[PDB]
């Protein structure tokens, strides 16, 4: 019943095979079987393991230096063995002017505490981790939430029977060649080699400490243009630079840690175990009242809300699509076999009217409902 409103709706004729994508709705119809509506709600990956952590924004602190006069060897710092610092050796002009006995190039060493301000973590997703949440709500006019992993299910729907669902989890992505690049809030699905080839400082996924960054030299450039001074300089936030790099990439709507996807499916089901509710019921001998007026959907079909006023209580609704003279039937019902479960409860009726002018019937002769509908084309 949920698909009434969604423009992306597909109608399937049963006995079959259905294609479940995100945002899309599927309405299944089979003779003497209740109409069912199928929708993929969540295509989330359960527990994702981190592959690599990249530093996008960095800062330099705790600057220390040591120098030697020419022909006195290279200098040494205790910060050089500390992998929290970016350390660089160089050469500077020395002489009488800067306290050196000899004129020439004097060795200098500079160390600076590299710290990460903003980072990102490209994760690992296996096809076995994917949790597909498929909802099945029968078209009654008054619904089980089924979970499916790539490792068949018997969807038992209350008062109707069972659905024999079997899905093909092939959306089209090979999750071995893919990386789930999470970045602060947003996330993307990129190629493996592309991710591992990024020129940014990184930490292994296994790392918890978050200090000994590999390749710190990507964000930090050491400049000595006049042989006077060796200068450190961070390259600034690579956040926006990254977003531009991830244009064509498939986005991921992750909500607090857990990562939800835009899915796709090629499901197969069996209507053998399904049965139409209220077959041992009478007809509603009383009168109806339009709760909500006739409305054409984004597809040729029409919906209607009514409320039973008689004392018939659990009874079948007399619904007929006919001409002015009541002569013959013309259309078909989408909400197959309508039922008034309780008179003080309204009932939604989807029906497909024929092309051109027709008449919708709700109830029997005393207080009978006559409604004309003209269907385009």
């Amino acid at each position: 019943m949920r698909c009434i409103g969604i423009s992306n709706r597909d109608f399937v004729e049963g006995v079959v095979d259905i294609v479940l994508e995100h945002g899309s709705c599927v309405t299944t119809m089979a003779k003497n079987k209740p109409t069912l509506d199928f929708e993929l709600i969540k295509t989330e990956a359960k527990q994702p393991a981190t592959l690599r952590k990249y530093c996008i924004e960095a800062k330099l602190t705790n600057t220390t230096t040591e120098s030697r006069c020419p022909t006195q060897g290279e200098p040494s710092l205790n910060e050089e063995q500390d992998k929290r610092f970016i350390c660089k050796h160089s050469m500077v002009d020395r002489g009488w002017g800067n306290g050196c006995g000899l004129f020439g190039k004097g060795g200098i060493v500079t160390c600076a505490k590299f710290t990460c301000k903003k980072n990102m973590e490209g994760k690992i997703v296996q096809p076995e981790n994917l949790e597909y949440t498929i909802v099945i709500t029968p078209h009654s006019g008054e619904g089980k939430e089924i979970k499916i992993t790539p490792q068949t299910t018997e969807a038992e729907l209350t008062g109707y029977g069972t659905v024999t669902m079997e899905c093909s989890p092939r959306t089209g992505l090979d999750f071995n060649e893919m990386v789930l690049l999470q970045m602060e809030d947003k996330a993307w699905l990129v190629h493996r080699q592309w991710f591992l080839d990024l020129p940014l400082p990184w930490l292994p996924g296994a790392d918890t400490q978050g200090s000994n960054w590999i390749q710190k030299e990507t964000l930090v450039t050491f400049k000595n243009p006049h042989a006077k001074k060796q200068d450190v300089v961070v390259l600034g936030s690579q956040e926006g630079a990254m977003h531009t790099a991830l244009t064509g990439a498939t986005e991921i709507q992750m909500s607090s840690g857990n990562l939800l996807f835009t899915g796709h499916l090629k499901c197969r089901l069996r209507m053998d175990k399904l049965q139409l509710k209220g077959m041992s019921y009478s007809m509603c001998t009383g009168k109806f009242k339009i709760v909500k007026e006739i409305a054409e959907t984004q597809h040729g079909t029409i919906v209607i809300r009514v409320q039973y006023e008689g004392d018939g209580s659990p009874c079948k609704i007399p619904f007929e699509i006919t001409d002015l003279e009541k002569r013959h039937v013309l259309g078909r019902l989408i909400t197959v076999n309508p039922i008034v479960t309780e008179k003080d409860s309204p009932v939604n009726i989807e029906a497909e009217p024929p092309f051109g002018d027709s008449y919708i019937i709700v109830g029997v002769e005393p207080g009978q409902l006559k409604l004309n509908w003209l269907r385009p084309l």
Partner: antibody, heavy 127, light 110 residues
Framework: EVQLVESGAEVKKPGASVKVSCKASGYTFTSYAMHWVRQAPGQRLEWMGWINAGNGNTKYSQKFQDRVTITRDTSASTAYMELSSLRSEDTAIYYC?????????????????????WGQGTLVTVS | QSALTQPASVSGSPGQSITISCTGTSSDVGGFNYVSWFQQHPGKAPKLMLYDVTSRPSGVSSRFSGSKSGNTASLTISGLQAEDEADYYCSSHTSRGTWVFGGGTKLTVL
């Protein structure tokens, strides 16, 4: 000519914080680095650190690394040194002494004549 | 603990020459020419006497001389004058970019 004048005598109880000014006159203050040196009672001189008055950069001694904070006032030609969590050991005369900075404003190597000009001193007494 | 080895006190007859030593390491006095000497008369602030081992400022007497051998620097005051009775301190700029001082020497004119 060149006159380095630091704040008057101050008496402070243990654990407190002292701020000592050092007004530079008779020269271009912005093109010089102000150094801070403490003179213990009848003992050796101790170098505490410096401030490049140009850019504002500082280098502190390991002994005073997380207790001393050196600041500057370009608009009033003054150099300030703040010593936090003071002890009976800190009872000393505090001196400020200048040194020229490279023509480009950087301060890698100092000038051969480092403390050419000093201040009168400031006795900080810890009771 | 003093970073530079300086003798406690020195005494000399008026008009005679005397030498004050300053021992350092390969990372300050041994490796760099950044060696300075300061004269401090009681009460007064220190006064730069010698810089770059040998050199001396404008308003400083030519009696004061500087020397350096290995990791040891020397202050030599030839011909002891009256207003010489003061405290002398040697200093050095280290490889690590810091400044070190000596213990100090009390000079006595007698």
């Amino acid at each position: 000519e060149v006159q380095l004048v630091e704040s008057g005598a101050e008496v402070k109880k243990p654990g407190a914080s002292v701020k000592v000014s050092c007004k530079a006159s008779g020269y271009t203050f912005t093109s010089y680095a102000m150094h801070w040196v403490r003179q213990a009672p009848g003992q050796r001189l101790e170098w505490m650190g410096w401030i490049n008055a140009g850019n504002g950069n500082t280098k502190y001694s390991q002994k005073f690394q997380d207790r001393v904070t050196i600041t500057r006032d370009t608009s009033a030609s003054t150099a300030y040194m703040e010593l936090s969590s003071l002890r009976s050991e800190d009872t000393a005369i505090y001196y400020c002494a200048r040194d020229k900075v490279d023509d480009y404003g950087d301060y890698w190597f100092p000038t051969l004549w480092y403390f050419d000009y000093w201040g009168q001193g400031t006795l900080v007494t810890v009771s | 603990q003093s970073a530079l080895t300086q003798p406690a006190s020195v005494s000399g007859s008026p008009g005679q020459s005397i030498t004050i030593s300053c021992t350092g390491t390969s990372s300050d006095v041994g490796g760099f020419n950044y060696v300075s000497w300061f004269q401090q008369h009681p009460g007064k602030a220190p006064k730069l006497m010698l810089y770059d081992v040998t050199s001396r400022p404008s308003g400083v007497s030519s009696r004061f001389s500087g020397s350096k051998s290995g990791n040891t620097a020397s202050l030599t005051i030839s011909g002891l004058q009256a207003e010489d009775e003061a405290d002398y301190y040697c200093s050095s700029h280290t490889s690590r970019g810091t400044w070190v001082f000596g213990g100090g020497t009390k000079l006595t004119v007698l």
